[PDB]
Amino acid sequence: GPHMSYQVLARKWRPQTFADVVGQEHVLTALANGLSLGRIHHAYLFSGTRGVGKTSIARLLAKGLNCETGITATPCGVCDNCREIEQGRFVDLIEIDAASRTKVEDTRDLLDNVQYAPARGRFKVYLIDEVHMLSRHSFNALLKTLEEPPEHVKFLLATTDPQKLPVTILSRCLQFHLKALDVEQIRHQLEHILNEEHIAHEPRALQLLARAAEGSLRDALSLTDQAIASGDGQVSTQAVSAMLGTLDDDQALSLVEAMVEANGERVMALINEAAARGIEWEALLVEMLGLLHRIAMVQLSPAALGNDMAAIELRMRELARTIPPTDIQLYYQTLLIGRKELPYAPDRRMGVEMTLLRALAFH
Amino acid sequence: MIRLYPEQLRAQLNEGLRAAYLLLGNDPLLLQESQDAVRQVAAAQGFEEHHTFSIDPNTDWNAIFSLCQAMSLFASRQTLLLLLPENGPNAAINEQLLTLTGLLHDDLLLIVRGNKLSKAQENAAWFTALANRSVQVTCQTPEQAQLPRWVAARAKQLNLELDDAANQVLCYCYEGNLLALAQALERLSLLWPDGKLTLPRVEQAVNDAAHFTPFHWVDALLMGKSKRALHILQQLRLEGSEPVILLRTLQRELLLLVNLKRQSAHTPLRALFDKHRVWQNRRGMMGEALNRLSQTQLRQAVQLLTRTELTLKQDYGQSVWAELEGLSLLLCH
Amino acid sequence: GPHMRWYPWLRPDFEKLVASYQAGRGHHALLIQALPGMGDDALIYALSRYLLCQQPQGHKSCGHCRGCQLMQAGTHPDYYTLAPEKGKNTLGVDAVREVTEKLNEHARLGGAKVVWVTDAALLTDAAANALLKTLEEPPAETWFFLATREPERLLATLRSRCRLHYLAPPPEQYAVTWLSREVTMSQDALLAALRLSAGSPGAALALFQGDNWQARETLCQALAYSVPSGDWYSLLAALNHEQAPARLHWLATLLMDALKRHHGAAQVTNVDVPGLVAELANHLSPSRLQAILGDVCHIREQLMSVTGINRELLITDLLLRIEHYLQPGVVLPVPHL
Amino acid sequence: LDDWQSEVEFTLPQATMKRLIEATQFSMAHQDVRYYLNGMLFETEGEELRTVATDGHRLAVCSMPIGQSLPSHSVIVPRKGVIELMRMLDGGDNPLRVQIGSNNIRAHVGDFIFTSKLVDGRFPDYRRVLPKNPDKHLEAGCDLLKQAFARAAILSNEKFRGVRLYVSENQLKITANNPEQEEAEEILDVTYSGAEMEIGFNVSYVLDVLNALKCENVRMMLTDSVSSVQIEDAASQSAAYVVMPMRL
Amino acid sequence: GPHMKFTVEREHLLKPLQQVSGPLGGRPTLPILGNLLLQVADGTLSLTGTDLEMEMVARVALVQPHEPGATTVPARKFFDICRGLPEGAEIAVQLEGERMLVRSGRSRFSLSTLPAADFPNLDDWQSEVEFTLPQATMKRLIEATQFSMAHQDVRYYLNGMLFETEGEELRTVATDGHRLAVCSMPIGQSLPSHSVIVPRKGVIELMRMLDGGDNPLRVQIGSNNIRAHVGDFIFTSKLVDGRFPDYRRVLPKNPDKHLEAGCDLLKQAFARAAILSNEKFRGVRLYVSENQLKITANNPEQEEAEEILDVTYSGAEMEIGFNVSYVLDVLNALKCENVRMMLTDSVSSVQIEDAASQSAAYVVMPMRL
Ligand SMILES: Nc1ncnc2c1ncn2[C@@H]1O[C@H](COP(=O)(O)OP(=O)(O)O)[C@@H](O)[C@H]1O
Ligand code: BEF
Ligand SMILES: [Mg+2]
Ligand SMILES: [Zn+2]
Ligand SMILES: [Zn+2]
């Protein structure tokens, strides 16, 4: 009854078949063909940035691997084993969060476990996630069970970043680099989800949400939930724009045109106004970087104008004409390093002020 | 309550005993000497059973009721000893001491060792009830002004005829603990049973006391002797001395040196020497330390020191010995 | 303090952030981003009181029930707090481990199962990755809350599970009015407090009721002798109170105001020390001034990040480097890479 | 605080509850990674109370009729709750009023009140665990098997006490080796009607099952040298046990 | 090598192994301390259990042709196999060189062996006294003297019992804090004077193995080795050196107050006073008046216990504190219904003898409550 029948989109719309996964065809194809042809490896290491699907691909692989209907690239999804693995109550798929089970006691427990028979499925599979922070002792104890396990043991490793793995651990498992999801893929999946759940939206807000989340579908859905929590349960351009606090090209170009002409007083007044409206400073810096990039493109070849908006492209054309490429490069470099140092700045606003005032250095 | 000094305790022990004894201080040589002097006094007065307890945070009520049961009526007379925590009595033992103060008999002689306590700890009721019954012994390590006099007297009780140069070098090499002074004195006495402590004899040993940290490493830089302090650092790295401690010594001393360097243009040297209350025997080297090392040298040295401490702090440790000897070789110019 | 303190401008946000839970569509996680002392703690507390209350009143918590009576006594069996111990500063894997292992059991009082992390930036990354599973997929009727001064310093993964709710500082005039009603002194001090604290009225209150304000005054006076004489070393005693980050921040704010005074700007942060601002502009060269400001910010970062660093050595080297820079003929650094 | 209403109400003899807990207690997980394992499943259906315990290498199911019409319900009680439940109920008093709610369990035993919170989650089904086509069967007296395994367990490995069963028409055989390169071997006269088979068990769980089985004659069911065993009372079907074998 | 052969019935094999288990196992510091030594002598098997200071030898009678020889086998595993086997099944034991084969019924076992690692002389006594103390004598002596002796005490010699043989009688004494025990058993034999201290653990081992109140025993006591032949089996222990207080100097302290009467009534009163006795200072107060005793207790729980007893007395009014546990052990080991009690002072030792006979005497130094 009051048990919260609603579930968050980041988990409700988790992939349930190899045909429901957005992108990563470079790994879905390999996994499905390996399932079908009869070549299955005893340790799979899915690695990629946040919210790209390592856990989901691993869970689909587990669903397929120990389905009672043979070992097929297409799990049935109606049997028992599919249902429990989807629910996560299956005995033979064991979830180990490597942050916790890093002491030698837990690793010894795991190595004791691997020596026995399964219970319900063909294969007993350890989904170890965030493996890249097992203590060195844990990895050295885990080498033997990751190298030559028994017949019914397969390992599925999920890591946020491959770098922290001991390279020997990398070498014994099958690496799958999950590519970050392209903006087009994210926007199409969002369109499909929101149409499926009978939620009104418009493509513009979808593009904004895709741009904000740097290639992480879970991040896209998190921003979707934030955008529907505020704004009467709907996705709209004004809603997402307010949620992100993003700014139109006019204001950022006002900043770059005042700063390129060393109009320090105007620059500081613009920053004061932006603070009064309370924008996100990182957004200001990314807009300045984008405008400087477009100016550089126009300088290189006149064909690539600013035509995506083309509203105040007169100003962009004039600024390109009136500024040497070197000065624009210096402005971009200064703003970019400043952007790199926002977290280290004592305050965001003052960090942007430092960066802009330093850009004001050239005459 | 009778507060006494370690040398003057014996006389009191001869005149009359007190059921409760307290030994507060950091220097453990006088602590153990007073403890076993009182113990041999009690043994001379028939006390046979000697119980000692190590009271820790782990020590608790079930670690003290056996104590209380001990001193009721077993045989003849006995003594008790305790070891107090580093911070002194806590609230956990604040009641245990109150209970212990409720039963004082000539059967049991109570001995307590420890370091200095907060003024709110002796303000407790158990201490007040123990005032007339107990005797406290001061056991801190005093300044170095009375150090030569005290060590000369001690060597006299050790039957050692020290020279002025021997006294100077032995004091200057061991300003850390009376344990060091002792071990040096007994080493010298056993090596030379005659007792005459000539400077050529006392200088040999193995080195200047030990490899220490400050004395000669810093002093040679103060006078600018690169070879001396450099060899001292080589020996320090040979014995694996902790680099962090060396850095702490440099931080605590070079800052005073920098303070000395300032104001020298618009104030006579001796006024700055006595304004900081720096030791005159140290002032004799501070003079040429200021004279030789200029302000630019100080700035460069502090800059490289900060770079070194930085690189050391985030677990890099990029050849700490190389940068330390670099500091030394800058300070020798 | 006792149940902390509600703040008047927080009332709108909470309302919005409770609507998402009244409809039942509330995302289990929540990463509230708010400045120190802003008032996010009261928001999280009031939210949890509404959530674990057996009878949730409209926009209120209960009015009367045992379910939050055990909350007021701070002894609810579901409500868990994750804060580093008073003697430590890093939240260990052990506390999050205990909380998450005790989450798998049912709800004791038949209601929700609410967790709370007092401050997320303090979470050790190992603790963050131990808490990752619990945040991504919690059991039914399990909710979470978190507080951060900034989200970007958090682990790349932990924020990705959560919604990044934001607490906008109140409008400048409203904050000034509230602080004037609370603390009585000249408005220049109040503007300095708000702009220094990036708009956090609670942080301005902490600055006033804390000794630092007077110490801040001290620094001003010290600079009033340093800059006209080129004698900065005497600032050491002013900048060493275990508040080297905050005091260095005040110094950098002053230097920012001076550089603003060069490229004459209508508004500057330090409005209680305009004469100091003018003097700082007068004596110091803009390239030297920017190099010095960069060094001040760099040293403040070095002190804030690495604990166990020696404050005295760092500040002494900083002051010596500044004194060196005020000498003509020096080459100044420029940020890069 | 207002008490929670119960959706499962019944009353039990102390003998029945004691038998169930003794039958399944040694078969539940300790701190195991799978959170829903560290506990005991109390299924009820018809007039029968069933108890299930597993740790991924073991399974104890014990079914006893109650005579009371009961709904189909499931519940998990964690380690501590059931341990102090067994400690709590020891006398011969009839009152065992057991109440199962959505989140907690309470058993009233006269003047003592049981209280614990249920492990949220759904237990795996035991019928899917018990082999469905056991094509090999064995029979022997319970005490003979128990004494034999206890004797053979003397010289096994310490931490994991593996033993090897060679089951054939001629007789049953069990062997044990240890890190000390020590050999133990012994023979039992069970009635078999099949060919040779080799399996590897852990003597700890087998010994526990035999000790808490508490019957006269015992029957083993087997399918394969890797599949699960099904040990049961040869004279009753109120309790079944499974021991997933060991790799060698 | 030499090889050994045995066909030994289980029941007649268990009791020796079960008995010798004392100086066996128990955190064996060496691979040889935790093992039992077997040897064949004529028609007997000797089982030796060693812990470097107590050597226990058991003689299993052999009834079948058995191959001679000796070996060292893990004591615990041998005990477990010999116990778990079916009752009455003869066990066939063979030495397969480095291994130890043992078979029984339908079961086979192998053991790791040690050839020779605990075979020195192992014992050398002096035997000043060789009294043939019969079973029942030291039975009651030791049960009346053990009590709860020194644990962690700095005075090492107070751990072991003091034996003193003189004339026709042996006096056994034991000091521990307040409590002190002594029994003067009339052996009746013309025996030389001898004084010795035996370890407490050796005493408890001897008493535990003792049992069976029928057979006279041979006790050979020296200055460093004591041997006791309890019927079939043999035990040997080291000997603690002197510095022990003289019982002739702690027992007779010129008692002046005399008392008598029931012992079990005092037991019940002491148990009921122990409920409200000082939990930190174990002991209650005893008011002594003419033909009357009063027992009072005041625990920190602010509960007062008082009882009155009819104990004969013709001395002066007295108030003596005492440990309830020590005197309760005195009463329990006195095995009598009536006791005699001699008071000296509130800080001087209080004697308690058996009212049945002088053979049993005890001392408790009073408490200050
Ligand atoms: N390739 C993908 N296809 C479809 N949805 C995806 C994909 N990757 C991520 N997602 C979305 O992200 C959510 C979390 O995905 P997950 O697989 O847990 O990422 P991770 O690799 O970081 O554990 C899923 O519930 C799903 O909505
Ligand atoms: F969020 Be994912 F598992 F990197
Ligand atoms: Mg994941
Ligand atoms: Zn399926
Ligand atoms: Zn309420």
Give the DSSP E fraction of chain D (strand runs of 2 or more residues): 35-45%
Radius of gyration of chain D: 19 Å
Strand order of the largest sheet of chain D: 4-2-3-17-16-15-9-13
Number of strands of chain D: 17
CATH fold name of the largest domain in chain A: Rossmann fold
Query: In one word, what is the shape of chain D?
Result: elongated
> Per DSSP, what share of the residues of chain A sits in E-state strands of 2 or more residues?
5-15%
> What radius of gyration of chain A results from the CA coordinates?
26 Å
> What does the largest sheet of chain D look like?
8 strands, antiparallel
Secondary-structure-derived class of chain D: alpha+beta
| Individual helix count of chain A | 17
List of distinct ligands in this structure: adenosine-5'-diphosphate, beryllium trifluoride ion, magnesium ion, zinc ion
Total E-strand runs of chain A: 5
**Spatial gap, N to C terminus of chain D:** 56 Å
SSE pattern of chain D: EHEEEHEEEEEHEEEEEHEEE
Please state the second-level CATH architecture of the largest domain in chain A: 3-Layer(aba) Sandwich
Listing every helix as H and every strand as E from the N terminus to the C terminus, the arrangement of chain A reads HHEHHEHEHEHEHHHHHHHHHH
The span between the termini of chain A is 69 Å
Proportion of residues in helical segments of chain D? 10-25%
PDB class: replication
Keywords: Bacterial Clamp Loader Complex, replication
Entry title: Structure of the E. coli clamp loader bound to the beta clamp in a Semi-Open conformation
Chain A: DNA polymerase III subunit tau
